Design a protein around this nucleic acid. Structure first.
Ligand SMILES: [Mg+2]
Ligand SMILES: [Mg+2]
Ligand SMILES: [Mg+2]
Ligand SMILES: [Mg+2]
Ligand SMILES: [Mg+2]
Ligand SMILES: [Mg+2]
Ligand SMILES: [Mg+2]
Ligand SMILES: [Mg+2]
Ligand SMILES: [Mg+2]
Ligand SMILES: [Mg+2]
Ligand SMILES: [Zn+2]
Lengths: 52, 170, 63, 190, 107
RNA sequence: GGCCAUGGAAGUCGGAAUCCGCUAAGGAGUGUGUAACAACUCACCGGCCGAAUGAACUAGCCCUGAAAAUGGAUGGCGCUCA
């Protein structure tokens, strides 16, 4: 089991992200555009879904 | 290569109207043949007159008042793009009114693909006050004690081969 | 339906609540919070009869 | 737009001697010297005084102007690396399998040896960059201290250690095991 | 357009309370909660009025109006940082009994 | 600890609601955290620096959109302030 203090540190790298809707990119949560050229730097982003 | 012309014309006198109003336009044209042609182009955009029913009264070159005084010009434009019709305003640095218009024609050709046929010059005004300057790409030359070098000078050679290493100091 | 001339009593029995201006502000706190339920507050719902005396309708400047 | 001139001001603390010649920066401080070649950028340098340096770009376009404050920031990072140092603290995050981390030396090279990560029999080895010091924290359980003068080497070794512990073929939202950077600071506390 | 009206009401009630009472001293706080502030004005119903706001508005809105009520002038350079106002008139002791009463600290 | 739902939901499970009072500041709450609170983070208002900043739109070049079969064609080489 992971302590809650360490679980937030790990979640900062694995979970707190946004995802490009066309090419599936792991983006910073605050990002407004995708960094990949293949999708045309689209603004169509959505948060990475969480376990529930 | 352009000149600024004052072209004055009028409707042909009739027994009803024997002295029609005289209208003047300032035309930037390469020669006097296009100056009188451009004049009729704009009168038929505004006044019920034609070249067949009108008469050119005077064509005169308008020389720069102070051709060796550095000025900043604001030019108001109305140009046609591939999709619609647009108004625009731009600023140019030059010593003659004609030379700013020549820069304008080169400038809208390069950034907007606007040909000479697609441009209407609404107004050319010399900006007297430094507060009258709105655009930052010419306002940067109105700062006090402006200095700048010209790094990386490339010298044009008359010969194909040079026996010494190239340099770019300047 | 209340007041039943006792909504001031609900405010002066709950005298330790709203840190308002002068007593009558405490009467307004119950006015706002009892609006959330929704019954026979003088015919309709509050945020209406409240806003009457909030601006000035009849008379509750009770001392 | 070709901005006529753009400037940034470096600040040199009292004990530090920056030294620039032909876009080769050598920063000297109490903690040592760091050097960096910037021949891939067109910038010019002026020594304002012994405590300040002006960094200038003449007639630069948007991207070439953008490359100016990054030069400033890199030299500032060099200065604080030779006057304060850098320290990255890493916490070992595991749910079930303890991560067995040792500082080994093989073939005359220092390595960080990770064992039993997610129960694997594999032994992970990360080369320790030159000028970088590793230490197993005594005051904290499951903590690694990466320290050194150069911020780039320290952060890149830390990233190497973090990256070698990536989870494959699992829901990484659930399988949060790994080695993660928890604190990015300096050797000298402020 | 609503900001310049709440600004005007702020200056309107700033000067409404200036002449109703009088002289005022130093009044600075920090790390003070919203519940922390409700306690002082709970016991100070009428003998004092807890004026509040900010800094930059207060300094200029009075400095330019130093014509109807000059006197202050050199009294403005005192306004620095997190500063409120308690508008009343009592004595150097009679107000610190009713105001300084509530304090919350921390280690 | 708003009402009702709920084993429990106290802002952060779900429905009518979206109010009031102090404020300059605060939503019957933008999130993380709890069985639930607590807890912190926001929404907005403060102190600080001090001269600019945000949004929508228009059209130039470039990029994504743009998948076919022998190896190969701006005519070729090659060309990037051309
Ligand atoms: Mg007409
Ligand atoms: Mg230009
Ligand atoms: Mg141009
Ligand atoms: Mg046309
Ligand atoms: Mg030669
Ligand atoms: Mg699976
Ligand atoms: Mg692109
Ligand atoms: Mg294409
Ligand atoms: Mg080819
Ligand atoms: Mg050429
Ligand atoms: Zn993408």
């Amino acid at each position: 089991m992971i302590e809650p203090s360490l679980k937030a540190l790990a979640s900062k790298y694995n979970c707190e992200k946004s995802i490009c809707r066309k090419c599936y990119a792991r983006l910073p949560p605050r990002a407004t555009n995708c960094r990949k050229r293949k999708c045309g730097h689209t603004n169509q982003l959505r948060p990475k879904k969480k376990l529930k | 290569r352009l000149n600024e012309y004052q072209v004055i014309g009028r409707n042909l006198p009739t027994e009803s109207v024997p002295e029609p109003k005289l209208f003047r336009m300032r035309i930037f044209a390469p020669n006097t043949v296009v100056a009188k042609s451009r004049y009729w182009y704009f009168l038929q955009k505004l006044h019920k007159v034609k070249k067949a029913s009108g008469e050119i009264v005077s064509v005169n070159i308008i020389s720069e008042a102070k051709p060796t005084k550095v000025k900043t010009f604001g030019i108001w434009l109305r140009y046609e793009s591939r999709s619609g019709i647009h108004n625009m305003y731009k600023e140019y640095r030059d010593v003659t009114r004609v030379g700013a218009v020549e820069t304008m024609y080169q400038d809208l050709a390069a950034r907007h693909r606007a040909r000479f046929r697609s441009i209407h010059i609404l107004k050319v005004v010399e900006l007297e006050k430094t507060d009258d300057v709105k655009r930052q790409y010419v306002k940067q030359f109105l700062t006090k004690d402006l200095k700048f070098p010209l790094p990386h000078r490339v010298q044009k050679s008359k010969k194909l081969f040079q026996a010494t290493a190239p340099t770019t100091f300047y | 339906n209340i007041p039943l001339d006792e909504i001031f009593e609900i405010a002066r029995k709950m005298q330790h609540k709203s840190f308002g201006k002068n007593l009558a502000s405490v009467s307004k706190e119950i006015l706002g919070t009892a609006q959330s339920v929704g019954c026979r507050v003088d015919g309709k719902n509050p945020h209406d009869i409240i806003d009457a005396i909030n601006a000035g309708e009849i008379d509750v400047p009770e001392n | 737009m070709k901005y006529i001139q753009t400037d940034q001001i470096l600040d040199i603390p009292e004990g530090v001697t920056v030294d620039i010649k032909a876009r080769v920066v050598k920063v000297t401080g109490p903690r040592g010297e760091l050097t960096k070649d910037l021949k891939h950028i067109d910038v010019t340098f002026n020594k304002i005084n012994n405590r300040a340096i002006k960094i200038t770009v003449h007639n630069g376009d948007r991207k070439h102007v953008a490359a100016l404050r990054t030069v400033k920031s890199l030299i500032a990072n060099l200065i604080t690396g030779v006057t304060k140092g850098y320290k990255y603290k890493m916490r070992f995050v595991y749910a079930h399998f303890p991560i067995n981390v040792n500082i080994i030396k093989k073939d005359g090279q220092d390595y960080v040896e990770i064992r039993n990560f997610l129960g694997e029999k594999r032994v992970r080895e990360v080369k320790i960059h030159e000028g970088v010091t590793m230490e197993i924290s005594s005051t904290q359980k499951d903590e690694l201290i990466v320290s050194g003068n150069s911020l780039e080497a320290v952060s890149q070794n830390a990233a190497d250690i973090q990256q070698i512990c990536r989870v494959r073929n699992k829901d990484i939202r659930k399988f949060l095991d790994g080695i993660y950077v928890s604190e990015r600071g300096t050797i000298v506390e402020e | 357009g609503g900001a310049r009206e709440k600004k005007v009401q702020y200056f309107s009630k700033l000067r409404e309370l200036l002449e109703e009472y009088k002289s005022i001293f130093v009044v600075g706080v920090d790390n003070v909660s919203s519940q922390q502030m409700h306690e002082i004005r709970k016991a100070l119903r009428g003998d004092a009025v807890v004026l509040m706001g900010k800094n930059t508005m207060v300094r200029r809105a009075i400095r330019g109006f130093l014509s109807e009520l000059p006197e202050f002038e050199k009294l403005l350079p005192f306004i620095k940082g997190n500063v409120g106002f308690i508008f009343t008139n009592g004595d150097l002791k009679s107000i610190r009994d009713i105001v300084v009463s509530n304090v919350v600290a921390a280690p």
